[PDB]
Amino acid sequence: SFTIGKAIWLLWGLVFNNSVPVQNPKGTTSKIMVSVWAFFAVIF
Amino acid sequence: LTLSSAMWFSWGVLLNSAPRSFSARILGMVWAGFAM
Protein backbone atom coordinates (compact mmCIF):
# COMPACT_ATOMS: atom_id res chain seq x y z
CA SER A 1 0.00 0.00 0.00
CA PHE A 2 3.09 2.19 -0.32
CA THR A 3 5.02 0.88 -3.35
CA ILE A 4 2.98 2.44 -6.17
CA GLY A 5 5.85 4.34 -7.77
CA LYS A 6 8.41 3.11 -5.24
CA ALA A 7 8.92 -0.04 -7.32
CA ILE A 8 10.96 2.19 -9.65
CA TRP A 9 13.42 3.07 -6.88
CA LEU A 10 13.20 -0.54 -5.64
CA LEU A 11 14.40 -2.08 -8.91
CA TRP A 12 16.74 0.85 -9.62
CA GLY A 13 18.46 0.22 -6.28
CA LEU A 14 18.45 -3.53 -6.83
CA VAL A 15 20.29 -2.95 -10.12
CA PHE A 16 23.46 -3.02 -8.01
CA ASN A 17 22.29 -6.01 -5.90
CA ASN A 18 21.95 -4.03 -2.64
CA SER A 19 19.05 -1.74 -1.72
CA VAL A 20 16.37 -1.19 0.91
CA PRO A 21 14.21 -4.35 0.96
CA VAL A 22 10.51 -3.75 0.40
CA GLN A 23 8.28 -6.82 0.76
CA ASN A 24 7.72 -8.44 -2.63
CA PRO A 25 4.15 -9.62 -3.36
CA LYS A 26 2.83 -13.17 -3.23
CA GLY A 27 1.94 -13.32 -6.92
CA THR A 28 5.18 -15.17 -7.89
CA THR A 29 5.94 -12.28 -10.28
CA SER A 30 8.24 -9.66 -8.75
CA LYS A 31 10.37 -12.31 -7.04
CA ILE A 32 11.01 -14.22 -10.28
CA MET A 33 11.78 -11.12 -12.37
CA VAL A 34 14.06 -9.75 -9.63
CA SER A 35 15.78 -13.16 -9.47
CA VAL A 36 16.43 -13.07 -13.23
CA TRP A 37 17.65 -9.47 -13.04
CA ALA A 38 19.82 -10.31 -10.02
CA PHE A 39 21.43 -13.16 -11.95
CA PHE A 40 22.05 -10.68 -14.76
CA ALA A 41 23.53 -8.21 -12.27
CA VAL A 42 25.86 -10.91 -10.93
CA ILE A 43 26.92 -11.47 -14.55
CA PHE A 44 27.40 -7.71 -14.93
CA LEU B 1 1.37 -20.35 2.10
CA THR B 2 4.32 -21.85 3.98
CA LEU B 3 5.36 -24.02 1.01
CA SER B 4 5.46 -21.19 -1.55
CA SER B 5 7.25 -18.97 0.99
CA ALA B 6 9.90 -21.62 1.66
CA MET B 7 10.34 -22.11 -2.10
CA TRP B 8 10.73 -18.36 -2.62
CA PHE B 9 13.20 -18.19 0.27
CA SER B 10 15.17 -21.03 -1.34
CA TRP B 11 15.26 -18.91 -4.49
CA GLY B 12 16.13 -15.84 -2.38
CA VAL B 13 19.21 -17.53 -0.95
CA LEU B 14 20.56 -17.86 -4.50
CA LEU B 15 19.13 -14.45 -5.45
CA ASN B 16 22.04 -12.72 -3.61
CA SER B 17 20.23 -9.40 -3.13
CA ALA B 18 13.06 -16.28 6.61
CA PRO B 19 10.86 -19.13 7.89
CA ARG B 20 11.38 -21.18 11.05
CA SER B 21 14.84 -22.71 10.54
CA PHE B 22 15.72 -24.13 13.98
CA SER B 23 17.99 -26.71 12.34
CA ALA B 24 17.48 -25.59 8.73
CA ARG B 25 19.64 -22.49 9.21
CA ILE B 26 22.73 -24.72 9.01
CA LEU B 27 21.44 -25.98 5.66
CA GLY B 28 20.79 -22.43 4.50
CA MET B 29 24.18 -21.12 5.59
CA VAL B 30 26.07 -24.00 3.95
CA TRP B 31 24.07 -23.60 0.73
CA ALA B 32 24.58 -19.82 0.72
CA GLY B 33 28.33 -19.99 1.38
CA PHE B 34 28.68 -22.68 -1.28
CA ALA B 35 26.66 -20.62 -3.77
CA MET B 36 28.75 -17.48 -3.27
Q: What is the 3-state secondary structure (H, E, C) of chain A?
A: CCCCCHHHHHHHHHHHCCCCCCCCCCCCCHHHHHHHHHHHHHHC
Residue B17 contacts A, CB cutoff 8 Å: yes
**CA proximity to A34, closest of A24, B2, A43:** A24
Count of CB atoms within 10 A of residue A3's CB? 14
Instruction: Label residues A12-43 b or e (16+ Cβ within 10 Å = b).
Output: eebeeeeeeeeebeeeeebbeebbebbeebee
Is the separation of the CB atoms in A38 and A17 below 8 Å? yes
How many Cα atoms sit within 13 Å of A35 on the Cβ side? 15
Chain A with chain B: Cβ pairs closer than 8 A: 25
Count of CB atoms within 10 A of residue B17's CB? 18
Q: Which residues of A touch B1 (CB under 8 A)?
A: 26
Residue B14 contacts A, CB cutoff 8 Å: yes
Asked if B15 and A14 come within 8 Å (Cβ–Cβ), the reply is no
Method for structure elucidation: cryo-EM
